[PDB]
Amino acid sequence: GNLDIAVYWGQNFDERSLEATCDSGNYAYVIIGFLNTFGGGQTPALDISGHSPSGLEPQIKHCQSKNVKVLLSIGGPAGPYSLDSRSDANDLAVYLFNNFLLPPGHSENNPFGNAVLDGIDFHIEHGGPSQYQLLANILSSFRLKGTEFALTAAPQCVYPDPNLGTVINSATFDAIWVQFYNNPQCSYSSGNAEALMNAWREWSMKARTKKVFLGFPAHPDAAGSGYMPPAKVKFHVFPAAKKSYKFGGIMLWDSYWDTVSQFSNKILGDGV
């Protein structure tokens, strides 16, 4: 009926703006990616495909005024990020908290100005579990201190996830969006959704989170494999998945490609 869609934004310089993405009306969550440099003596850096970080301040406020939640994603598909020591975890938890999850005051100084984000998304694609449990414990502590925000995760579709499975088992994530793409063991391929349905059954039964979202590519070009057309998604997936207490909705990789394909418009029946 009413379907929640989460979308990644920030992956191309020429993409539809953050504010226009929120104005579409298609999305419950917009995830800005990525804080992709941290750890191992590096200072943190954003790679958001050349968008001005300060120029996002008023766009995030606008999104929030339309009841879209805006999250920052850490890690990403690529980047020199690692979290091997306990000191890295602490340092990163503190940086994220001051600079993104709390209002200013002052000397910080916030990459997105005075915006305060609605949560942090763990999109950890390499480095094993490392100290990511400790990072989640600390952030989760801050959540219990009155500063309210979401913690989400984007594991790959093989259960348990090699990077995050350990952290997911702690039940700390409010939601997770499993990437049902780029891996033929657990995503749609060759007119065959059996591998997908099986992975989905496993994730919806075992993952310790209240909401599980299905992550699909928005266009055949958006991923190496796993593209599944909207009509097939509605027909094949929805009836079974809506039978799960944990069914959260779908996640789309990504806003740039969804602008081209109109995948979310087809899934929703032309929603504005």
Burial 130-150 (b: 16+ CB within 10 A, else e): bbbbbbbebbeebbeeeeebb
What residues make up the domain containing 39? 1-272
- CATH number for the domain including 128? 3.20.20.80
- The C-alpha atoms of residue 128 and residue 112 are separated, in whole angstroms, by 29
- The C-alpha atoms of residue 272 and residue 46 are separated, in whole angstroms, by 31
Longest Cα–Cα distance of the chain, Å, equals 55
Data resolution in angstroms: 2.2
Closest C-alpha to 58, from 18, 90, 86, 97: 18
- The C-alpha atoms of residue 171 and residue 166 are separated, in whole angstroms, by 10
Is residue 95 packed enough to be buried (19+ CB in 10 Å), middle (13-18) or exposed (0-12)? middle
DSSP string, 61-112: HHHHHTT-EEEEEEEESSSSB---SHHHHHHHHHHHIIIIIS---SSS--TT
- Technique used: X-ray
Residue 148 φ then ψ, to 5°:
-100, 130
DSSP string, 7-61: EEE-S-TTSPPHHHHHHTS--SEEEEEEEEEEETTEEEEE-STT--TTTHHHHHH
**How many domains does the chain fold into?**
1
The β-bridge relationship of strands 119-124 and 69-76 is parallel
Positions marked active-site: 125
Q: Which helix (H) or strand (E) holds 263?
A: helix 263-268
| 246: its two tokens | 């944990």
